[PDB]
Design an enzyme around this catalytic site. Sequence first.
Site, short mmCIF file in Angstrom:
data_model
loop_
_atom_site.label_atom_id
_atom_site.label_comp_id
_atom_site.label_asym_id
_atom_site.label_seq_id
_atom_site.Cartn_x
_atom_site.Cartn_y
_atom_site.Cartn_z
N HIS A 60 0.82 -1.26 0.00
CA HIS A 60 0.00 0.00 0.00
C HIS A 60 0.82 1.27 0.00
O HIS A 60 0.29 2.34 -0.27
CB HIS A 60 -1.09 0.10 1.09
CG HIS A 60 -0.72 -0.41 2.44
ND1 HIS A 60 -0.88 -1.77 2.78
CD2 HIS A 60 -0.16 0.20 3.48
CE1 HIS A 60 -0.45 -1.91 4.04
NE2 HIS A 60 -0.02 -0.74 4.52
N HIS A 90 6.48 7.01 5.92
CA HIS A 90 5.94 6.51 4.63
C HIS A 90 5.27 7.75 3.99
O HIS A 90 5.23 8.81 4.60
CB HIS A 90 4.91 5.41 4.58
CG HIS A 90 3.78 5.73 5.51
ND1 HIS A 90 3.75 5.29 6.84
CD2 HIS A 90 2.65 6.49 5.33
CE1 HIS A 90 2.67 5.74 7.39
NE2 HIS A 90 2.02 6.48 6.55
N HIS A 92 2.20 9.02 0.86
CA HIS A 92 0.90 8.89 0.16
C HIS A 92 0.99 9.75 -1.07
O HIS A 92 1.14 10.96 -0.81
CB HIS A 92 -0.33 9.23 0.93
CG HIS A 92 -0.48 8.50 2.20
ND1 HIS A 92 -1.17 7.31 2.27
CD2 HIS A 92 -0.07 8.78 3.48
CE1 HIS A 92 -1.18 6.84 3.53
NE2 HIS A 92 -0.50 7.72 4.26
N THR A 194 -4.81 6.44 8.92
CA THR A 194 -5.54 6.72 7.71
C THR A 194 -5.71 5.49 6.75
O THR A 194 -6.22 5.57 5.62
CB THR A 194 -4.85 7.90 6.94
OG1 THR A 194 -3.55 7.52 6.58
CG2 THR A 194 -4.97 9.18 7.89
N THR A 195 -5.27 4.36 7.26
CA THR A 195 -5.35 3.07 6.64
C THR A 195 -5.79 2.17 7.77
O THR A 195 -5.43 2.39 8.92
CB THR A 195 -4.00 2.54 5.97
OG1 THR A 195 -3.10 2.29 7.07
CG2 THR A 195 -3.48 3.54 4.94
ZN LIG Z 1 0.20 7.77 6.28
#
Ligand SMILES: [Zn+2]
EC number: 4.2.1.1
Length: 255
Positions: A60, A90, A92, A194-195
């Site tokens: 993801h 990470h 997005h 948010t995941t």
């Molecule tokens: Zn994030």
Amino acid sequence: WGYGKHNGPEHWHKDFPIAKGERQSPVDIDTHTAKYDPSLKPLSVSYDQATSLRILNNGHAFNVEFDDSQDKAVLKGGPLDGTYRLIQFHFHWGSLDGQGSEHTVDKKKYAAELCLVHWNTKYGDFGKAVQQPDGLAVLGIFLKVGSAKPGLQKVVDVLDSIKTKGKSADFTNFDPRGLLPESLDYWTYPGSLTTPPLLECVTWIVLKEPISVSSEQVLKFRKLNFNGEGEPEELMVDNWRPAQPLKNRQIKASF
Ligand SMILES: [Zn+2]
């Protein structure tokens, strides 16, 4: 769960009911409504002693992991109480430059969003912290397309080695200090991951000042694959969740 038409964000609530909870993230930062809070202390980022270990493509996004067995890279101050240890970072991003950030400012979306994830050491481990309302602190930084960002180049050059899901690569001596803006001015609010599992355990710290990356840096991100090696190729593009309802919650500003 994923970001496609059949498993995207509009579907997560079936498996993860908290998806419609009361303190979901991300959200739209209305700058005129956010409240200047004089009682907010400056952020305190101590990352000089950071130890990166590896980078991995989890299906993801791609997480850069750090050794969190000691207070080597920590966040404190601001709206926070206690010491939060940096575990991973990470991003997005989007398929186009016009989209990719999770958090928005006055409805404006950025090319990407950088998340530095930290956990409260009062809880002992990351696993225990996700179980608490004040368990995590995520430092969010926006990315705009302009000049290249020298400190981001080492991450970009290793993407090729972790193209598909499940791949990982040794990734030592990486200094996250290279990814910070000049100003530490921020907006903060109580939210969530948010995941999935979308645990409502985060104190969001979203930096006002964005960092600029070149078109080519961002392009290397768009070449990642959601799929595992030997499967049809699905580009890792648009791995961001749409803005959720603020719901009574207040966004405070440090400036
Ligand atoms: Zn994030």
